[PDB]
Amino acid sequence: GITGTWYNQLGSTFIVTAGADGALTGTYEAESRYVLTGRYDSAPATDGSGTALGWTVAWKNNYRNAHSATTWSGQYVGGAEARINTQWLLTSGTTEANAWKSTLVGHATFTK
Amino acid sequence: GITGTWYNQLGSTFIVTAGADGALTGTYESAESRYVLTGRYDSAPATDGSGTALGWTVAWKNNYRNAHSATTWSGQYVGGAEARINTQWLLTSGTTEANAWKSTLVGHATFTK
Amino acid sequence: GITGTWYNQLGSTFIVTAGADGALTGTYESAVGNAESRYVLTGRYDSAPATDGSGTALGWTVAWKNNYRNAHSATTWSGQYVGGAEARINTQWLLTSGTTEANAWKSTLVGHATFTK
Amino acid sequence: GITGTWYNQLGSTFIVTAGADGALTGTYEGNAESRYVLTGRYDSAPATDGSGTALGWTVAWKNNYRNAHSATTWSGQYVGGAEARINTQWLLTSGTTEANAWKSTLVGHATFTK
């Protein structure tokens, strides 16, 4: 039940298809729509533990380019009240002299 | 200059193809140690001397093993004749909700061509 | 403002004093009601915050060693104090364990935590 | 072992005293307007198996001369030897409005040399 539409508190949403390959494809949301791609464990444990996954978005589309990219690392918790809990990293292009301020960290919980 | 073969501090290698649309596709070998990678990058970076932002994902499942884990690498590409990728990474393992708090490792890694 | 007792719904509390000189001093109780769950906290905070509605930057550290136990590890929380009818402190944390250099790649966990007064 | 003067790449220096109590005290910097107070904790009885010593400290970027309305925390470990080093991951948080809270925290890493 990863496949579907997910919403986050700050009002971002995304649409993903989970393939049998372990591939993740979709969009993160026209001028605000970006391509997403990632991977998940297509054979998780059945001991109650969640399903590890991660995905990337580059913040460039045919309308805008913020010269940066975000990655989300987390797990999927299934059932009726399904959730994806993540932590993310956002890196912007910078000079070497200013690389030390190039990466933000944060967290986000998604609901279906 | 992203397309190609990269090696890091202790024995990891990946082969990556950077596509016009901005896709990153390739293979990550942690040493049978090969795994699928996929990610995104800025295919129209600035020309003021800044680096090129990118990120990628590896889920540690191949046909030979499954670690119930995935790592994401976030960083930037730096050209030159000393071309490199500086990243920070997050590694999340599948856990029980009770153990969620210790689900995620953080680290950094530099890669060379 | 910051001075007082703070709780995280997962069964943890801390008592702190925010000093005139930017210092944070108190005790962290890992497990509500458990006296052997108590550790020294120390930190720093911005004693002259912006008055534009911004929160107050702060940080503290706890090494997980006391008279009772030693986990060979330390956590640092980085975040901000946000005033309101219900005051909160929003943080990101790092937990580092001692390891050999061979295992250093797995020495540090990252997470987040919110505390309410 | 930890007590002493430490250097990292960028050009930053910190002077610290490790107390018997697990206390870490010192300064992050010798000109005064670049000088900030640090406090932290360390594992005062590390494992005896080759492991490093866990430690952490905090700096609030306010002094008599300036205020950046932010704070950095360093989390890492000390590794002894004649090439002793401190390896750290860090978090820098700035005070923001409700609206900017999502970008209030930077992460990085840093190695310090004695």
For chain C, the structural domain boundaries read 1-117
Q: Distance (Å, rounded) from C-alpha D109 to C-alpha A89?
A: 14
* CB B9 within 8 Å of CB C105: no
**Contact by Cβ (8 Å): B42, B54:** yes
Half-sphere exposure at residue D17, Cβ-oriented, CA atoms within 13 angstroms: 7
- The helix or strand, by DSSP H or E, that contains position B31, with its residue range, turns out to be none
Technique used to solve these coordinates? X-ray
DSSP one-letter code for B43: S
Does B49 contact A at CB distance below 8 Å?
yes
B82-89 own/partner pairs: CB under 8 Å, 24+ apart: B83/B1, B83/B112, B83/B113, B84/B110, B84/B111, B84/B112, B84/B113, B85/B2, B85/B6, B85/B54, B85/B110, B85/B111, B86/A99, B86/B51, B86/B110, B87/B111, B88/A89, B88/A91, B88/A103, B88/D107, B88/D108, B88/D109, B89/A89
Instruction: Pull the structure tokens for residue A17.
Output: 């298809």
Task: Determine the CATH number of domain B1-113.
Answer: 2.40.128.30
Q: In this structure, which amino acid lies at residue D39? A: T
Q: How far is CA A97 from CA A102, B51, B65, D91, in A?
A: 10, 11, 41, 19
CATH of the domain spanning C1-117, picked from 2.40.160.20, 2.40.128.30, 3.40.50.720, 3.10.150.10: 2.40.128.30
Residue of C10, C105, C109 with shortest CB distance to B104 = C109
**For D54, which of C56, C79, C97 is closest by C-beta distance?**
C97
| Interface residue C97 vs chain D (CB under 8 A) | yes
Residue of A nearest to B78 (CA): A96
- How far is B83 from B80, CA to CA, in rounded Å? 5
CA pseudo-torsion sign B24, A85, C39, D68: positive
Contact state of C110 with B101 under an 8 Å Cβ cutoff: no
CATH topology of domain D1-114: Lipocalin (2.40.128)
Looking at domain A1-112, its CATH architecture is: Beta Barrel (2.40)
Contact A56 B52 (CB under 8 A): no
Query: Cα–Cα distances in Å, from C16 out to C43, C48, C66, C69, C115?
Result: 10, 18, 18, 22, 13
A19: tokens are 């393939």
CA quadruple D92, D97, D98, D103: dihedral, nearest 10 = -40
How far from chain centre, in Å, is Cα A3? 13
Resolution (A): 2.0
The answer to whether the CB atoms of D72 and C56 lie below 8 A apart is no
